[PDB]
Protein backbone atom coordinates (compact mmCIF):
# COMPACT_ATOMS: atom_id res chain seq x y z
CA UNK A 1 0.00 0.00 0.00
CA UNK A 2 2.04 2.92 -1.35
CA UNK A 3 -0.43 5.49 0.01
CA UNK A 4 0.11 4.65 3.70
CA UNK A 5 3.62 6.16 3.91
CA UNK A 6 2.32 9.49 2.60
CA UNK A 7 -0.72 9.42 4.88
CA UNK A 8 1.41 8.72 7.94
CA UNK A 9 3.79 11.55 6.96
CA UNK A 10 0.93 14.01 6.43
CA UNK A 11 -0.84 13.14 9.69
CA UNK A 12 2.28 13.50 11.80
CA UNK A 13 3.18 16.72 9.98
CA UNK A 14 -0.25 18.09 10.96
CA UNK A 15 0.02 16.76 14.51
CA UNK A 16 3.48 18.18 15.13
CA UNK A 17 5.14 17.75 18.53
CA UNK A 18 3.03 15.47 20.76
CA UNK A 19 5.33 15.50 23.79
CA UNK A 20 3.32 15.34 26.98
CA UNK A 21 -0.04 15.86 25.25
CA UNK A 22 -3.28 14.02 25.95
CA UNK A 23 -4.69 12.43 22.80
CA UNK A 24 -8.05 11.00 21.76
CA UNK A 25 -7.77 8.68 18.73
CA UNK A 26 -11.23 8.40 17.11
CA UNK A 27 -12.21 5.57 14.76
CA UNK A 28 -9.02 4.03 16.06
CA UNK A 29 -9.30 0.53 14.55
CA UNK A 30 -6.56 -1.59 16.12
CA UNK A 31 -4.95 1.62 17.42
CA UNK A 32 -2.26 2.28 14.78
CA UNK A 33 -2.16 6.08 15.07
CA UNK A 34 -2.82 6.38 18.78
CA UNK A 35 -0.13 3.79 19.52
CA UNK A 36 2.43 5.56 17.33
CA UNK A 37 1.44 8.93 18.81
CA UNK A 38 2.27 7.43 22.21
CA UNK A 39 5.59 6.07 20.90
CA UNK A 40 6.56 9.65 19.97
CA UNK A 41 5.96 10.89 23.51
CA UNK A 42 2.27 11.56 24.16
CA UNK A 43 1.35 11.71 27.84
CA UNK A 44 -1.92 9.79 27.49
CA UNK A 45 -3.75 8.16 24.57
CA UNK A 46 -7.40 7.05 24.52
CA UNK A 47 -8.82 5.16 21.53
CA UNK A 48 -12.47 4.92 20.47
CA UNK A 49 -14.05 2.68 17.83
CA UNK A 50 -17.64 1.59 17.25
CA UNK A 51 -16.58 -2.04 16.64
CA UNK A 52 -16.16 -4.33 19.65
CA UNK A 53 -14.11 -6.61 17.40
CA UNK A 54 -11.73 -3.78 16.53
CA UNK A 55 -11.37 -2.74 20.17
CA UNK A 56 -10.67 -6.35 21.16
CA UNK A 57 -7.92 -6.40 18.54
CA UNK A 58 -6.67 -2.98 19.65
CA UNK A 59 -6.46 -4.14 23.28
CA UNK A 60 -4.56 -7.29 22.31
CA UNK A 61 -2.10 -5.13 20.34
CA UNK A 62 -1.45 -2.97 23.40
CA UNK A 63 -1.02 -6.11 25.52
CA UNK A 64 1.53 -7.48 23.06
CA UNK A 65 3.64 -4.29 23.17
CA UNK A 66 2.74 -3.39 26.77
CA UNK A 67 1.69 0.20 26.03
CA UNK A 68 -0.81 2.13 28.20
CA UNK A 69 -3.45 2.92 25.58
CA UNK A 70 -7.03 2.84 26.87
CA UNK A 71 -9.79 1.87 24.45
CA UNK A 72 -13.53 2.40 24.41
CA UNK A 73 -16.34 0.97 22.31
CA UNK A 74 -18.44 3.99 21.35
CA UNK A 75 -20.28 5.49 18.39
CA UNK A 76 -18.53 8.83 17.88
CA UNK A 77 -21.71 10.37 16.45
CA UNK A 78 -23.58 9.54 19.70
CA UNK A 79 -20.65 9.41 22.10
CA UNK A 80 -20.77 9.44 25.89
CA UNK A 81 -18.48 12.33 26.93
CA UNK A 82 -14.87 11.23 27.48
CA UNK A 83 -13.12 14.36 28.74
CA UNK A 84 -11.12 16.98 26.92
CA UNK A 85 -7.79 16.48 25.15
CA UNK A 86 -4.95 18.54 23.67
CA UNK A 87 -5.30 16.58 20.43
CA UNK A 88 -8.09 14.65 18.72
CA UNK A 89 -6.77 12.48 15.89
CA UNK A 90 -9.36 11.12 13.45
CA UNK A 91 -7.84 9.11 10.61
CA UNK A 92 -10.74 7.72 8.52
CA UNK A 93 -13.57 8.69 10.86
CA UNK A 94 -15.66 11.26 8.99
CA UNK A 95 -16.01 9.23 5.78
CA UNK A 96 -18.00 6.66 7.77
CA UNK A 97 -20.68 9.21 8.66
CA UNK A 98 -23.71 7.92 6.72
CA UNK A 99 -25.54 11.27 6.58
CA UNK A 100 -24.74 14.96 6.80
CA UNK A 101 -26.59 15.00 10.12
CA UNK A 102 -24.21 12.32 11.39
CA UNK A 103 -21.14 14.13 10.07
CA UNK A 104 -22.27 17.24 11.94
CA UNK A 105 -22.80 15.28 15.16
CA UNK A 106 -19.26 13.90 14.88
CA UNK A 107 -17.74 17.37 14.54
CA UNK A 108 -19.78 18.50 17.56
CA UNK A 109 -18.53 15.56 19.62
CA UNK A 110 -14.97 16.38 18.56
CA UNK A 111 -15.35 20.01 19.62
CA UNK A 112 -16.73 18.92 23.00
CA UNK A 113 -13.67 16.69 23.38
CA UNK A 114 -11.14 19.49 22.83
CA UNK A 115 -9.37 21.76 25.26
CA UNK A 116 -9.69 25.44 24.25
CA UNK A 117 -6.12 25.50 22.88
CA UNK A 118 -6.43 22.00 21.40
CA UNK A 119 -6.77 20.88 17.83
CA UNK A 120 -8.36 18.29 15.57
CA UNK A 121 -6.16 16.45 13.10
CA UNK A 122 -8.18 14.41 10.61
CA UNK A 123 -7.64 12.35 7.47
CA UNK A 124 -10.65 11.83 5.24
CA UNK A 125 -11.88 11.46 1.66
CA UNK A 126 -11.11 14.49 -0.50
CA UNK A 127 -14.53 15.96 -1.48
CA UNK A 128 -13.19 16.65 -4.99
CA UNK A 129 -12.33 13.00 -5.68
CA UNK A 130 -14.07 11.83 -8.86
CA UNK A 131 -13.98 8.13 -9.71
CA UNK A 132 -13.94 8.87 -13.45
CA UNK A 133 -10.70 10.85 -13.09
CA UNK A 134 -8.81 7.69 -12.11
CA UNK A 135 -8.97 4.81 -9.69
CA UNK A 136 -6.72 4.66 -6.65
CA UNK A 137 -5.90 0.96 -6.99
CA UNK A 138 -2.22 1.52 -7.72
CA UNK A 139 -1.96 3.42 -4.41
CA UNK A 140 -3.70 0.65 -2.45
CA UNK A 141 -7.46 1.45 -2.51
CA UNK A 142 -9.55 0.07 -5.37
CA UNK A 143 -12.66 2.26 -5.60
CA UNK A 144 -15.22 0.03 -7.30
CA UNK A 145 -18.16 2.41 -7.79
CA UNK A 146 -19.60 5.84 -7.03
CA UNK A 147 -23.31 6.40 -6.44
CA UNK A 148 -25.38 9.41 -5.46
CA UNK A 149 -26.51 9.22 -1.81
CA UNK A 150 -28.60 12.21 -0.85
CA UNK A 151 -26.35 15.27 -1.05
CA UNK A 152 -23.15 13.16 -1.16
CA UNK A 153 -21.76 9.95 -2.68
CA UNK A 154 -21.34 6.32 -1.65
CA UNK A 155 -18.29 4.30 -2.68
CA UNK A 156 -17.71 0.58 -2.41
CA UNK A 157 -14.01 -0.17 -2.33
CA UNK A 158 -11.40 -2.75 -1.44
CA UNK A 159 -7.88 -2.62 -0.08
CA UNK A 160 -5.42 -4.15 -2.52
CA UNK A 161 -4.54 -6.98 -0.12
CA UNK A 162 -4.52 -10.78 -0.11
CA UNK A 163 -7.37 -11.33 0.11
CA UNK A 164 -8.70 -7.93 -1.03
CA UNK A 165 -10.67 -6.53 1.90
CA UNK A 166 -14.02 -4.91 1.03
CA UNK A 167 -15.36 -1.76 2.67
CA UNK A 168 -17.79 1.08 1.97
CA UNK A 169 -17.61 4.79 2.73
CA UNK A 170 -19.16 8.19 2.04
CA UNK A 171 -17.89 11.28 0.22
CA UNK A 172 -19.50 14.44 1.57
CA UNK A 173 -19.04 17.77 -0.20
CA UNK A 174 -16.55 20.41 0.90
CA UNK A 175 -19.41 22.81 1.66
CA UNK A 176 -21.08 20.28 3.96
CA UNK A 177 -17.79 19.56 5.78
CA UNK A 178 -17.06 23.25 6.26
CA UNK A 179 -20.61 23.86 7.48
CA UNK A 180 -20.33 21.03 10.00
CA UNK A 181 -16.95 22.46 11.09
CA UNK A 182 -18.29 25.99 11.55
CA UNK A 183 -21.55 24.98 13.23
CA UNK A 184 -19.65 22.70 15.65
CA UNK A 185 -17.81 25.80 16.87
CA UNK A 186 -14.37 25.59 15.23
CA UNK A 187 -13.08 29.10 14.64
CA UNK A 188 -10.47 27.88 12.15
CA UNK A 189 -9.84 24.99 9.77
CA UNK A 190 -7.38 24.19 6.97
CA UNK A 191 -7.40 21.46 4.35
CA UNK A 192 -4.02 19.79 3.95
CA UNK A 193 -2.93 18.24 0.68
CA UNK A 194 -1.07 14.98 1.43
CA UNK A 195 2.69 15.54 1.67
CA UNK A 196 3.92 13.93 -1.53
CA UNK A 197 7.68 14.60 -1.53
CA UNK A 198 10.46 14.81 -4.10
CA UNK A 199 11.85 11.58 -2.63
CA UNK A 200 8.56 9.82 -3.46
CA UNK A 201 8.68 11.08 -7.04
CA UNK A 202 12.27 9.89 -7.45
CA UNK A 203 11.73 6.36 -6.11
CA UNK A 204 8.77 5.60 -8.43
CA UNK A 205 8.48 5.38 -12.23
CA UNK A 206 7.76 8.68 -13.99
CA UNK A 207 4.18 9.84 -13.69
CA UNK A 208 3.35 7.12 -11.13
CA UNK A 209 2.00 9.87 -8.87
CA UNK A 210 0.05 11.79 -11.53
CA UNK A 211 -3.40 10.47 -10.57
CA UNK A 212 -2.52 10.91 -6.90
CA UNK A 213 -1.99 14.62 -7.59
CA UNK A 214 -4.73 15.03 -10.22
CA UNK A 215 -7.45 13.10 -8.38
CA UNK A 216 -6.39 12.42 -4.80
CA UNK A 217 -8.73 10.20 -2.83
CA UNK A 218 -7.35 11.43 0.51
CA UNK A 219 -6.99 14.76 2.27
CA UNK A 220 -5.86 16.06 5.61
CA UNK A 221 -7.85 18.52 7.68
CA UNK A 222 -6.89 20.51 10.79
CA UNK A 223 -9.47 22.34 12.91
CA UNK A 224 -8.96 24.55 15.95
CA UNK A 225 -11.50 25.87 18.49
N1 LIG B 1 -19.52 6.16 14.02
C1 LIG B 1 -18.33 5.61 14.33
N2 LIG B 1 -17.77 5.79 15.55
C2 LIG B 1 -16.58 5.24 15.87
N3 LIG B 1 -15.87 4.49 15.01
C3 LIG B 1 -16.32 4.24 13.76
C4 LIG B 1 -17.61 4.80 13.34
N4 LIG B 1 -17.81 4.41 12.06
C5 LIG B 1 -16.74 3.65 11.70
N5 LIG B 1 -15.86 3.55 12.72
C6 LIG B 1 -14.57 2.83 12.70
O1 LIG B 1 -13.63 3.55 11.91
C7 LIG B 1 -12.63 2.65 11.44
C8 LIG B 1 -12.16 3.05 10.04
S1 LIG B 1 -10.63 2.24 9.68
C9 LIG B 1 -9.46 3.40 10.37
C10 LIG B 1 -8.75 2.81 11.57
C11 LIG B 1 -7.55 3.61 12.09
N6 LIG B 1 -7.88 5.03 12.44
C12 LIG B 1 -6.45 3.60 11.07
O2 LIG B 1 -6.22 4.60 10.38
O3 LIG B 1 -5.76 2.60 10.91
C13 LIG B 1 -13.23 1.25 11.57
O4 LIG B 1 -12.51 0.56 12.61
C14 LIG B 1 -14.65 1.47 12.03
O5 LIG B 1 -15.10 0.48 12.96
UniProtKB/TrEMBL annotation:
<dbReference type="InterPro" id="IPR029063">
    <property type="entry name" value="SAM-dependent_MTases_sf"/>
</dbReference>
<dbReference type="GO" id="GO:0008168">
    <property type="term" value="F:methyltransferase activity"/>
</dbReference>
<feature type="binding site">
    <location>
        <position position="4"/>
    </location>
    <ligand>
        <name>S-adenosyl-L-homocysteine</name>
    </ligand>
</feature>
<feature type="domain" description="Methyltransferase">
    <location>
        <begin position="23"/>
        <end position="118"/>
    </location>
</feature>
<protein>
    <submittedName>
        <fullName>Methyltransferase</fullName>
    </submittedName>
</protein>
<dbReference type="GO" id="GO:0032259">
    <property type="term" value="P:methylation"/>
</dbReference>
<dbReference type="Pfam" id="PF13649">
    <property type="entry name" value="Methyltransf_25"/>
</dbReference>
<feature type="binding site">
    <location>
        <position position="49"/>
    </location>
    <ligand>
        <name>S-adenosyl-L-homocysteine</name>
    </ligand>
</feature>
<keyword id="KW-0830">Ubiquinone</keyword>
<keyword id="KW-0489">Methyltransferase</keyword>
<feature type="binding site">
    <location>
        <position position="76"/>
    </location>
    <ligand>
        <name>S-adenosyl-L-homocysteine</name>
    </ligand>
</feature>
<feature type="binding site">
    <location>
        <position position="75"/>
    </location>
    <ligand>
        <name>S-adenosyl-L-homocysteine</name>
    </ligand>
</feature>
<dbReference type="InterPro" id="IPR041698">
    <property type="entry name" value="Methyltransf_25"/>
</dbReference>
<keyword id="KW-0808">Transferase</keyword>
Amino acid sequence: AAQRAIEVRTIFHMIGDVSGKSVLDLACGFGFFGREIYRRGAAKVVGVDISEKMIELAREESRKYGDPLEFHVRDVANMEPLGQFDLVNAAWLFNYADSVENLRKMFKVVRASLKPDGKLVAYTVDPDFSLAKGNFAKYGVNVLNERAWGPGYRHDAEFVTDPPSQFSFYRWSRADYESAIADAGFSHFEWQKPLLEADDIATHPPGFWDVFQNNCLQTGLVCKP
